[PDB]
Amino acid sequence: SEVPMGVEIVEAPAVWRASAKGAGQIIGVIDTGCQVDHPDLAERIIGGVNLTTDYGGDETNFSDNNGHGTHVAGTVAAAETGSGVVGVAPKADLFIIKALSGDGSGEMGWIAKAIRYAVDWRGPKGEQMRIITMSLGGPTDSEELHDAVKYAVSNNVSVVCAAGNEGDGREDTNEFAYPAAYNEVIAVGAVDFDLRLSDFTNTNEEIDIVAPGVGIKSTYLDSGYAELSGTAMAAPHVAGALALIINLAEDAFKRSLSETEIYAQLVRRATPIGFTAQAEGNGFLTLDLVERITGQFTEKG
Amino acid sequence: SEVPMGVEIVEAPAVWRASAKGAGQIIGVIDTGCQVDHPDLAERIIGGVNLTTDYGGDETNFSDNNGHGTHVAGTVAAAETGSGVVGVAPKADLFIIKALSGDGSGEMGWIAKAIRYAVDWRGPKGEQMRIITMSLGGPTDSEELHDAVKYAVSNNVSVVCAAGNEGDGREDTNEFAYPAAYNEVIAVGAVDFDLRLSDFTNTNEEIDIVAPGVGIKSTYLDSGYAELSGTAMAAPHVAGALALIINLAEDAFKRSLSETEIYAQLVRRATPIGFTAQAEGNGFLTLDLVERITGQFTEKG
Ligand SMILES: [Ca+2]
Ligand SMILES: [Ca+2]
Ligand code: NA
Ligand code: NA
Ligand SMILES: [Sr+2]
Ligand SMILES: [Sr+2]
């Protein structure tokens, strides 16, 4: 089906109805930018920015030299179309922030302003962003990346990061990457479709959750489709999951929720597997877990 | 058994082993003070303060004129003894803050300093407090009660409050009490042993969880035992639950956790019943829920 397996095990379809499919949420994608014209993405993308000196400092060209950030974006919100793929939140909107280059590398300061950009951003109506996603990592702790992050988190924005693919198969070796390594962030590691712990996934004391990250079919360059692998692919499932969660929990609680409140709601939709918390964090993302533990039986007409 | 039913449905016994029974955590009880000599409490109480002008401004007499704060304290940590009752965290220590009078009333400013006291407190080693509990409510929002609360929460202290017993049986009438009504607090409503929604429990958009609050047998005055009722009795189960949760989650995550992190861990040990979130918040406190969803089978020798 139009739906990939990762969007499936994560249980997004079980909650689309109650979540309005992510409708009304704007997700910032910080990556190598995006193919704006891909049929599976064009009505999701409502804008973007270029902060690399790719295309020579060209502030408004945020298309994709790599293919990476096109992939990630599909996982977050590839729309339903009969065609290709659907993302965890096919009614959420994507703001593209190209802060990586065609070589897939970026300088700490490209990231930091990307974060700030998205927080400080507004669009026509005053439509602001609530989730940001970054399937990208750096071995280096520079403060003020930290600060951009803390800037975000305390203006009720949720920050979702790939954990890093610099690890072995020991839960007990711990390997870090930034910004996933900061506490304020939602740091996502990777498992495959058999919930086996992918080898490359960084383990540490700051991992929040894991999601599918092996052979993820999603939107590719030149209106294509490709299967990539990495914690870069895990991260966006939890990015989308958050648009669902905000909607369905703001319904239920009948008000706005804090960053804190959102995180708690994410975490209660996580199911431990058999790995340590340094490896799986709070568990694997199971978006229907709350319904399932509650088991009300309702009429059917 | 020495164990009351509320400590039982809440599933405290299922996690005592892994939590060290609350060992190493100091819970502040803000109430009508406590019978320091009750056999079921004396080795739990490691100090206390009097901030009422009961016993004429007598700063160091924190015994109990009412019986209320003796009850609450038992629910939090009545120790195992073969005798009477056991609390949700029978190895946690209690600091008594009398800020209510023999008439069970207190002035907003007695509360506010009680909170501040406990935060700013230290004992011999530099043993500080992590949980505070307040089975007490006031119809009035005075800022700087708010601030005491925010003071607490941002110095990694968790604040646990009775929701209020000024409600009907409609989930949709919403009735408030302070400090339970502030967002930063963990506000607890009451259900009975059949998970029926007790009538008196305040409902609103700020309720976090519910726990047993009908006919709670606990430690009473003059080394007695009594069954009281109210959200005042719900609150302490979640107070104790937090000492368990901190211990077991700091084991698992192998570091210190923030206020945020603690709350998420509480909330994932809550099971919705069939009521709205205005009524049950995130659900009923089920301390073994995480194990149960994870279902690893381990050897037995
Ligand atoms: Ca490792
Ligand atoms: Ca009501
Ligand atoms: Na599609
Ligand atoms: Na006892
Ligand atoms: Sr985190
Ligand atoms: Sr709250």
Q: Does B172 contact chain A (CB < 8 Å)?
A: no
Distance B188 CA to ligand 6 centre (A): 9
Distance from CA of A270 to the nearest CA of B (A): 9
Name every chain B residue with its beta carbon within 8 A of the beta carbon of A174. Answer: none
Backbone angles phi, psi at A158, to 5 degrees: -100, 135
Residue of A182, A267, A298 to mutate, testing the B interface (most B Cβ within 10 Å of its Cβ):
A267
Backbone angles phi, psi at B242, to 5 degrees: -70, -25
- The chain A residue lying nearest B172, using CA atoms, is A254
Judged by its nearest atom, the ligand closest to the C-alpha of residue B169 is 2
- Supply A296's token pair: 């009300």
Q: Does A203 contact chain B (CB < 8 Å)?
A: no
Name every chain A residue with its beta carbon within 8 A of the beta carbon of B289. Answer: 293
Instruction: Choose among B270, B272, B277: nearest Cβ to A253.
Output: B277
Record: contact B253-A205, CB cut-off 8 A: yes
Element (H, E) at A290: helix A289-294
Q: Does B273 contact chain A (CB < 8 Å)?
A: yes
Q: Which distant-in-sequence residues (6+ apart) come within 8 Å of A73 by Cβ? A: A29, A31, A34, A41, A44, A45, A87, A94, A96, A219, A236
CB atoms under 10 Å from CB of A152, counted, come to: 24
Q: Does A205 contact chain B (CB < 8 Å)?
A: yes
Distance from CA of A290 to the nearest CA of B (A): 8
* A67-to-A7, A219, A223 alpha-carbon distances in Å: 20, 9, 10
Element (H, E) at A140: none
Instruction: Choose among A268, A272, A278: nearest Cβ to B294.
Output: A272
Strands B216-220 and B131-134: unpaired
Q: Does B298 contact chain A (CB < 8 Å)?
A: no
Name every chain A residue with its beta carbon within 8 A of the beta carbon of B153. Answer: none
* A118-to-A47, A153, A171, B206 alpha-carbon distances in Å: 11, 12, 34, 29
Give exposure, B197-223, as e/b (b: 16+ Cβ within 10 Å). Answer: bbebbbbbebbbbbbbbbebbbbbbee
Dihedral Cα B230, B235, B236, B241, nearest 10 deg = 140
Q: Residue B296 CA to chain centroid, in angstroms?
A: 31
**CA-based torsion, B294, A184, B246, A265: positive or negative:** negative
CB atoms under 10 Å from CB of A43, counted, come to: 12
Domain span at residue B221 reads 1-301
Name every chain A residue with its beta carbon within 8 A of the beta carbon of B255. Answer: 205
Judged by its nearest atom, the ligand closest to the C-alpha of residue B253 is 5
Distance CA B68, CA B86 (A): 17
Q: After which residues is chain B broken (C to N over 2.5 A)?
A: none
Picking from B97, B79, B96, B95, the residue whose alpha carbon sits closest to that of residue B87 is: B79
Distance A153 CA to ligand 5 centre (A): 11
DSSP chain B: --S-HHHHHTT-HHHHHHHGGGTT-EEEEEES---TT-TTTTTTEEEEEE-SSTTTT-TT----SSSHHHHHHHHHHPPPSSSS---S-TTSEEEEEE-S-TTS---HHHHHHHHHHHHH---TT-----EEEE---BS---TTHHHHHHHHHTTT-EEEEE--S---S-SSS----BTTTSTTSEEEEEE-TT----TT----TT--EEEE-SSEEEEETTTEEEEE-SHHHHHHHHHHHHHHHHHHHHHHHTS---HHHHHHHHHTTEE--SS-HHHHTT-EE-TTHHHHHH-------
Q: Residue A73 CA to chain centroid, in angstroms?
A: 9
Backbone angles phi, psi at B112, to 5 degrees: -50, -35
Judged by its nearest atom, the ligand closest to the C-alpha of residue B206 is 6
**CA-based torsion, B291, B293, B294, B300: positive or negative:** positive
Judged by its nearest atom, the ligand closest to the C-alpha of residue B86 is 4
Name every chain A residue with its beta carbon within 8 A of the beta carbon of B277. Answer: 252-254
The residues placing their C-beta within 5 Å of ligand 2, an ion, are: B 167, 170, 173, 203
Q: Does B278 contact chain A (CB < 8 Å)?
A: yes
Q: Does B195 contact chain A (CB < 8 Å)?
A: no
Record: contact B293-A294, CB cut-off 8 A: no
The residues placing their C-beta within 5 Å of ligand 6, an ion, are: B 208
CATH of the domain at B246: 3.40.50.200
- Greatest alpha-carbon pair distance for chain B in Å reads 60
Name every chain A residue with its beta carbon within 8 A of the beta carbon of B273. Answer: 294
**Angle, in degrees to the nearest 10, between helices B259-267 and A259-267:** 40
Instruction: Choose among B254, B259, B272: nearest Cβ to A294.
Output: B272
Name every chain A residue with its beta carbon within 8 A of the beta carbon of B265. Answer: 267
Q: Which distant-in-sequence residues (6+ apart) come within 8 Å of A120 by Cβ? A: none
Record: contact B254-A277, CB cut-off 8 A: yes
Distance B174 CA to ligand 2 centre (A): 5
Judged by its nearest atom, the ligand closest to the C-alpha of residue A164 is 1
DSSP-derived 3-state class of residue A251? helix
Q: Which distant-in-sequence residues (6+ apart) come within 8 Å of B79 by Cβ? A: B40, B41, B43, B44, B86, B87, B90, B91
Q: Return the ∠ at Cα B235 (arms to B167 and A291), rounded to 5°.
A: 80
Picking from B177, B209, B224, the residue whose alpha carbon sits closest to that of residue B280 is: B209
Distance CA B253, CA B5 (A): 30
Distance CA B177, CA B140 (A): 7
DSSP-derived 3-state class of residue A225? strand
Distance CA B298, CA B285 (A): 25
Record: contact B277-A254, CB cut-off 8 A: yes
Distance B88 CA to ligand 2 centre (A): 28
3-state helix, strand, coil in chain A (%, to 5): 30, 20, 55
From the number of C-beta atoms within 10 Å of its C-beta (0-12, 13-18, 19+), residue A264 rates as buried
Distance CA B240, CA B257 (A): 17
Distance B182 CA to ligand 6 centre (A): 7
* B15-to-A277, B50, B247, B249 alpha-carbon distances in Å: 17, 34, 10, 11
Name every chain B residue with its beta carbon within 8 A of the beta carbon of A183. Answer: 258
Give exposure, B71-94, as e/b (b: 16+ Cβ within 10 Å). Answer: bbbbbbbbbbeeebbbbbbbbbbb
Cited resolution, angstroms: 2.6
The residues placing their C-beta within 5 Å of ligand 5, an ion, are: A 208
Q: Which distant-in-sequence residues (6+ apart) come within 8 Å of A85 by Cβ? A: A2, A3, A4, A7, A40, A74, A78, A217, A218, A219, A225
Task: Provide the domain count of chain B.
Answer: 1
Distance A40 CA to ligand 1 centre (A): 36
Instruction: Choose among B253, B260, B271: nearest Cβ to A294.
Output: B271
Give exposure, A60-93, as e/b (b: 16+ Cβ within 10 Å). Answer: ebbbbbbbbbbbbbbbbbbbbeeebbbbbbbbbb
Method: X-ray
Name every chain A residue with its beta carbon within 8 A of the beta carbon of B283. Answer: 294
